Amino acid sequence: LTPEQIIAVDGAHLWHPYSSIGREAVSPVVAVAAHGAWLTLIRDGQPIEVLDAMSSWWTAIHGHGHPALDQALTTQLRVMNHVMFGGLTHEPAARLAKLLVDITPAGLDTVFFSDSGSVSVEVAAKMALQYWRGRGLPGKRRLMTWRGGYHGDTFLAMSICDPHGGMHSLWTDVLAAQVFAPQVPRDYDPAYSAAFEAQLAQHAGELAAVVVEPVVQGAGGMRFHDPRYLHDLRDICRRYEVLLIFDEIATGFGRTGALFAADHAGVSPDIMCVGKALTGGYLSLAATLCTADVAHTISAGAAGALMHGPTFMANPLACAVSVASVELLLGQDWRTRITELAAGLTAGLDTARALPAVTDVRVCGAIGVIECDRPVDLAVATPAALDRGVWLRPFRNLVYAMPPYICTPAEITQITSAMVEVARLVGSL
Amino acid sequence: LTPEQIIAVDGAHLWHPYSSIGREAVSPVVAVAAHGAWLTLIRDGQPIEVLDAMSSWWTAIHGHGHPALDQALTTQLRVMNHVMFGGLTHEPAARLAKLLVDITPAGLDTVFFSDSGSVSVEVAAKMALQYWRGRGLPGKRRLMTWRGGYHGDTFLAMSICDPHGGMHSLWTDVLAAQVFAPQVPRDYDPAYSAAFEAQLAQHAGELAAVVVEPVVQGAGGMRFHDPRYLHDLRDICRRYEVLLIFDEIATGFGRTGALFAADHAGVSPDIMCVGKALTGGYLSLAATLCTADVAHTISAGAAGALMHGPTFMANPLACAVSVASVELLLGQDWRTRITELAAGLTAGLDTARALPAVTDVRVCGAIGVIECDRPVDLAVATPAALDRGVWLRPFRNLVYAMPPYICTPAEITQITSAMVEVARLVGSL
Ligand SMILES: *Cc1c(COP(=O)(O)O)cnc(C)c1O
Numbered sequence: 001l002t003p004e005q006i007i008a009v010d011g012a013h014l015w016h017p018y019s020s021i022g023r024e025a026v027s028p029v030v031a032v033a034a035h036g037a038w039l040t041l042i043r044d045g046q047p048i049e050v051l052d053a054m055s056s057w058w059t060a061i062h063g064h065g066h067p068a069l070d071q072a073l074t075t076q077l078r079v080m081n082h083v084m085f086g087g088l089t090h091e092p093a094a095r096l097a098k099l100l101v102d103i104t105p106a107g108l109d110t111v112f113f114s115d116s117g118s119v120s121v122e123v124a125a126k127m128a129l130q131y132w133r134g135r136g137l138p139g140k141r142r143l144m145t146w147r148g149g150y151h152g153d154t155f156l157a158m159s160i161c162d163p164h165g166g167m168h169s170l171w172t173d174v175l176a177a178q179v180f181a182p183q184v185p186r187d188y189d190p191a192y193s194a195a196f197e198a199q200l201a202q203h204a205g206e207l208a209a210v211v212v213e214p215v216v217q218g219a220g221g222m223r224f225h226d227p228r229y230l231h232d233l234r235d236i237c238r239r240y241e242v243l244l245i246f247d248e249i250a251t252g253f254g255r256t257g258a259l260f261a262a263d264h265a266g267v268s269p270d271i272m273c274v275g276k277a278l279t280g281g282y283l284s285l286a287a288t289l290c291t292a293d294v295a296h297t298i299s300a301g302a303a304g305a306l307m308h309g310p311t312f313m314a315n316p317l318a319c320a321v322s323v324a325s326v327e328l329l330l331g332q333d334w335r336t337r338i339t340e341l342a343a344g345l346t347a348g349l350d351t352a353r354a355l356p357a358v359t360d361v362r363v364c365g366a367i368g369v370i371e372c373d374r375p376v377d378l379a380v381a382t383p384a385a386l387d388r389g390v391w392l393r394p395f396r397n398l399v400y401a402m403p404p405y406i407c408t409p410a411e412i413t414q415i416t417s418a419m420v421e422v423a424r425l426v427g428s429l
Numbered sequence: 430l431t432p433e434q435i436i437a438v439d440g441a442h443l444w445h446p447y448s449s450i451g452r453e454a455v456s457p458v459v460a461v462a463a464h465g466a467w468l469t470l471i472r473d474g475q476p477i478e479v480l481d482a483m484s485s486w487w488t489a490i491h492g493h494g495h496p497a498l499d500q501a502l503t504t505q506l507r508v509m510n511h512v513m514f515g516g517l518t519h520e521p522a523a524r525l526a527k528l529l530v531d532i533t534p535a536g537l538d539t540v541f542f543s544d545s546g547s548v549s550v551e552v553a554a555k556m557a558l559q560y561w562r563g564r565g566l567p568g569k570r571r572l573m574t575w576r577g578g579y580h581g582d583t584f585l586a587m588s589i590c591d592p593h594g595g596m597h598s599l600w601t602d603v604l605a606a607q608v609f610a611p612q613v614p615r616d617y618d619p620a621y622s623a624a625f626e627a628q629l630a631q632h633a634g635e636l637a638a639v640v641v642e643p644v645v646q647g648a649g650g651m652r653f654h655d656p657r658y659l660h661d662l663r664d665i666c667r668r669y670e671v672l673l674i675f676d677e678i679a680t681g682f683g684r685t686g687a688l689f690a691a692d693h694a695g696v697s698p699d700i701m702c703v704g705k706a707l708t709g710g711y712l713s714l715a716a717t718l719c720t721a722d723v724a725h726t727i728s729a730g731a732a733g734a735l736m737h738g739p740t741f742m743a744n745p746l747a748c749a750v751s752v753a754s755v756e757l758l759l760g761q762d763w764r765t766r767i768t769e770l771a772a773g774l775t776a777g778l779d780t781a782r783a784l785p786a787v788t789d790v791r792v793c794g795a796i797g798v799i800e801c802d803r804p805v806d807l808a809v810a811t812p813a814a815l816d817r818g819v820w821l822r823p824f825r826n827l828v829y830a831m832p833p834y835i836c837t838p839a840e841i842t843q844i845t846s847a848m849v850e851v852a853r854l855v856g857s858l
């Protein structure tokens with residue numbers, strides 16, 4: 001298919017994320033290649049090379065077409081593409097499980113594989129609810145979280161999305177009614193944690209779990225909070241016997257400067273979700289980890305088996321490329337790399353602070369954010385970024401980047417320069 | 430890793446489908462290769478080749494490692510592993526969308542890709558609810574189905590699984606309360622349809638959609654029903670203004686003897702889900718199709734964009750191998766192939782009818798079922814089939830096969846002989 005043919009088919013038949021089909025002002029750009037940190041896009045009939053500043057929605061941490069990950073996939077393809085995990089096991093699942101239990105916060109020793117982040121959140125919730133059924137306390141069936149959060153798009157995941165500002169706010173009337181604490185602040189304030197504890201204590205008898213994104217809230221606004229709040233949540237949850245669930249689907253695998261964001265606080269949750277960067281951005285995969293105690297209690301009393309079983313659970317191809325991606329991360333000085341990335345983002349974004357439409361500039365590990373004083377118009381931002389050789393995808397009032405870890409300092413500065421120029425145009429006519 | 434190393438890791442760390450970790454009597458068997466219709470499994474430390482009679486949970490319709498599908502994957506890998514579908518489009522998504530709209534029942538012209546079958550069902554429900562919001566009828570928010578059904582394991586999907594004796598039956602007190610008609614019979618009885626209509630009529634003002642598996646109900650009990658019931662559902666839904674959703678995640682791509690099971694009835698649903706065999710069993714992918722009316726009425730409306738967007742939406746690798754799998758199917762006389770398979774299954778399973786523990790033997794396309802009067806003990810069934818060179822995975826009281834379409838008559842004879850012996854052993858205790 002030619003790019004024009006792709007556009008024609010796409011316009012007629014393809015539904016894109018978070019969109020109204022046939023009614024979008026900005027049509028999709030045809031992508032025809034991806035190699036390393038770079039995408040080849042078609043613009044005005046011509047191929048152009050642009051930096052994947054988004055890591056393809058925060059997944060491509062080693063860039064595209066990395067030889068180690070390419071070869072892990074083709075090696076597995078030669079031996080066994082896929083077998084059913086109902087009754088069978090295999091080397092890629094075993095290797096990945098062993099890696100994941102070893103590098104995640106202490107105590108997480110069991111792994112349930114699934115095929116997407118939203119599903120892994122549903123599995124986490126099912127684990128928490130079934131845990132309390134196993135304890136003979138089925139009244140513990142609600143979830144508690146703080147505002148500003150995002151956890152996926154399936155219906156129970158939607159129920160812990162920010163109710164007022166979140167993307168799922170129109171569905172409130174048909175979603176499970178959960179408990180929401182106020183927006184967690186950036187700076188540490190003991191009064192916030194005291195209030196959180198007071199609220200949880202009032203509901204502890206009907207709460208299965210607290211579910212949060214640790215340190216960075218991504219899709220709900222790229223907000224950062226002090227890691228000490230996580231220490232407080234762990235303490236509160238322990239004392240009131242409410243399970244703690246960390247959704248690290250966006251924060252995992254080095255993105256915030258620690259291997260997992262929980263590590264900034266030294267905290268272990270009872271249950272943890274991972275995804276996105278898990279596969280290095282090659283294939284959809286996710287996992288839900290829990291403690292031995294959670295796993296065993298889930299089938300205690302009359303609760304029985306955990307009745308979940310995705311058709312492609314523990315897919316050998318996805319697991320094999322994840323093993324390679326994780327081993328590639330651990331086998332280098334990733335902490336120094338991310339520290340260098342963060343410094344590049346900070347240095348490169350500093351001039352944006354003085355721009356008239358900019359309300360905040362903030363960086364956490366390999367995440368760089370310009371918060372603007374109005375929603376960013378994609379019809380303006382997209383050409384401006386492409387004109388400067390960078391793929392950016394703003395949402396709401398945020399111009400942000402989550403770049404591949406393999407970006408050179410020059411490439412990071414190219415990305416930040418494009419972000420600054422997009423922000424300059426937001427406050428231009 | 431050696432098989433014994435895999436077993437040790439698996440026992441310590443891996444949660445398998447529908448199971449109580451650490452409490453399962455039958456431990457998983459190590460799989461070390463798959464090719465064509467065959468798996469290489471480890472029995473007492475030794476590698477044996479056995480037939481994948483289950484097609485790895487009904488996905489591997491062309492067998493494992495088919496050269497055309499292998500090549501399609503490796504070709505795409507060299508060019509572009511993945512890019513985000515938020516703002517970008519690409520050739521594999523366009524090619525697959527075009528194929529799917531062309532070969533599905535008439536009127537389905539819009540494709541929303543997702544990462545798993547359960548998610549595609551949640552997307553279908555979301556489309557249906559948002560449709561009626563777009564018509565100014567937000568009270569139309571419940572689903573109706575018949576008993577015996579299965580639609581996945583996420584919490585909305587669970588709500589249309591049969592609450593009485595279905596796999597999610599312990600969760601009734603938590604799930605959305607849907608409307609259930611009685612079990613649809615095998616033989617056509619217009620009285621059943623009239624009763625379904627009268628029940629639907631009473632609820633029409635609060636129903637968004639009827640959701641069913643057409644012709645074959647898979648995971649809920651391998652039951653078959655007359656296609657004329659689907660014709661009745663289409664008419665009832667038309668007259669009472671309720672959307673019709675067909676879940677073809679198990680029945681799609683030739684499995685029941687028609688390309689899609691809806692084709693047996695000659696009707697089209699408003700919304701359709703596909704998955705499993707979509708990728709030929711290589712990778713997790715699913716899709717939700719809808720009509721132009723549904724697509725355009727969503728976002729009419731005041732009701733805005735469809736707020737769903739899986740991170741790995743329309744993954745180029747998964748789309749590329751699916752395109753190859755679908756083209757491979759369409760490029761052969763698949764209808765004759767399935768007819769031959771059905772004949773082989775019928776001939777091979779016939780002697781099972783006389784067995785004392787057997788209550789029914791039934792075949793529909795490339796699906797063969799022996800229904801027993803008692804649960805099938807996996808601890809007995811698994812070694813018995815393996816020693817006969819066949820991988821079978823019974824569940825509840827069912828010994829069944831859904832073999833790869835590439836199985837030779839000899840291989841089908843081998844599969845059915847193993848099934849018959851399992852059924853024979855069931856009636857020995
Ligand atoms: C397999 C299947 C699904 C989806 O299950 P997943 O585990 O998410 O793949 C949904 N509906 C039907 C009828 C199925 O057979």
Ligand SMILES: *Cc1c(COP(=O)(O)O)cnc(C)c1O
Binds near residue numbers: 116121153219740741
């Ligand atoms: C991306 C993400 C998810 C899952 O979304 P999917 O679209 O299912 O991949 C869940 N939680 C968080 C915090 C995420 O960033």
Ligand SMILES: NCc1ccc(Cn2cc(Cl)cn2)cc1
Binds near residue numbers: 018057395396
């Ligand atoms: N479903 C995964 C996912 C990934 C990235 C984002 C970012 N985002 C995009 C929009 Cl539109 C709003 N937020 C939102 C959701």
Ligand SMILES: NCc1ccc(Cn2cc(Cl)cn2)cc1
Binds near residue numbers: 309310582
């Ligand atoms: N989630 C997909 C899927 C696929 C096959 C089956 C078959 N099955 C397995 C058991 Cl246990 C009960 N049914 C059940 C679920």
Ligand SMILES: NCc1ccc(Cn2cc(Cl)cn2)cc1
Binds near residue numbers: 653693
């Ligand atoms: N025409 C394909 C097809 C469709 C439905 C069934 C199941 N069934 C057949 C009859 Cl007759 C009653 N039920 C068996 C085969």
